[PDB]
Design a protein around this ligand. Structure first.
Ligand SMILES: [Zn+2]
Length: 257
């Protein structure tokens, strides 16, 4: 099955998922000088006051913090979006060392990690229908750099030892994703895809300009996770990022100058 090794990593995915070589694949390099400032872009509306986290899952490629998406309780709107998108889960991508890990890059710079808050368009009723539509998902992408600790991340870090291996989950209630946001909501946006199989071309990407700072100790705990299941040969969950894909016939727009 697909993964992030020599034998099954991103450069192999096209064999099972031919859309990997499609016209709107993610992630991409954000060339900051080429991105067009678009004064028509609205401020992002992130409304997470009523978010209900339920559970955290090691799915063998990342860990997902899952939310109750049975009502409009944690929603993204505004920005480049028309309508309302409900938060279903967040997860991260990260590296074996601090010099790589992000999926998007900024003028070819790689960050230590990247957070993806995944939301689906309520006009399609459920996530599985949304991913079949070109405007089905909105993913908020946030870069992580290593420096000061992110206090709001620590609850996530300190549950990872309970979900070390693929298929483990743990109760994860009352977690407030507002604690993972940077101060500014300035953003880049472009049309793209999920960055994991099935690589569906259903995403409006919203990538924040300002990274959050996490500590080296926080990121080191991410790197103690395992891709493998319980008892299997240990293969650390590191370098679970897809590299930048061709931009093709797309424009990246900036909300800011
Ligand atoms: Zn992701």
């Amino acid at each position: 099955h697909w993964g992030y090794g020599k034998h099954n990593g991103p450069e192999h995915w096209h064999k099972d998922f031919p859309i990997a070589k499609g016209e709107r694949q993610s992630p991409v390099d954000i060339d900051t000088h080429t991105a067009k400032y678009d004064p028509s872009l609205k401020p992002l509306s992130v409304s997470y006051d009523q978010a209900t986290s339920l559970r955290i899952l090691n799915n063998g490629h990342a860990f997902n913090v899952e939310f109750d998406d049975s009502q409009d309780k944690a929603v993204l709107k505004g920005g480049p979006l028309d309508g309302t998108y409900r938060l279903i889960q967040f997860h991260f991508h990260w590296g074996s060392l601090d010099g790589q890990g992000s999926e998007h890059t900024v003028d070819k710079k790689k960050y230590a990690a990247e957070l993806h808050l995944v939301h689906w368009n309520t006009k399609y009723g459920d996530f599985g229908k949304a991913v079949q539509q070109p405007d089905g998902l909105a993913v908020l992408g946030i870069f992580l750099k290593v420096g000061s600790a992110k206090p709001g991340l620590q609850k996530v870090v300190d549950v990872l030892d309970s979900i070390k291996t693929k298929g483990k989950s743990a109760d994860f209630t009352n977690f407030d994703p507002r604690g993972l946001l940077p101060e500014s909501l300035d953003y880049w946006t472009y049309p793209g895809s999920l960055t994991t199989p099935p690589l569906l071309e259903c995403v409006t990407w919203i990538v924040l300009k300002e990274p959050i700072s996490v500590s080296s100790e926080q990121v080191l705990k991410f790197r103690k996770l395992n891709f493998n299941g319980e008892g299997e040969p240990e293969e650390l969950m590191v370098d679970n990022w897809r590299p930048a894909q061709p931009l093709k016939n797309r424009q990246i727009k900036a909300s800011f100058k």
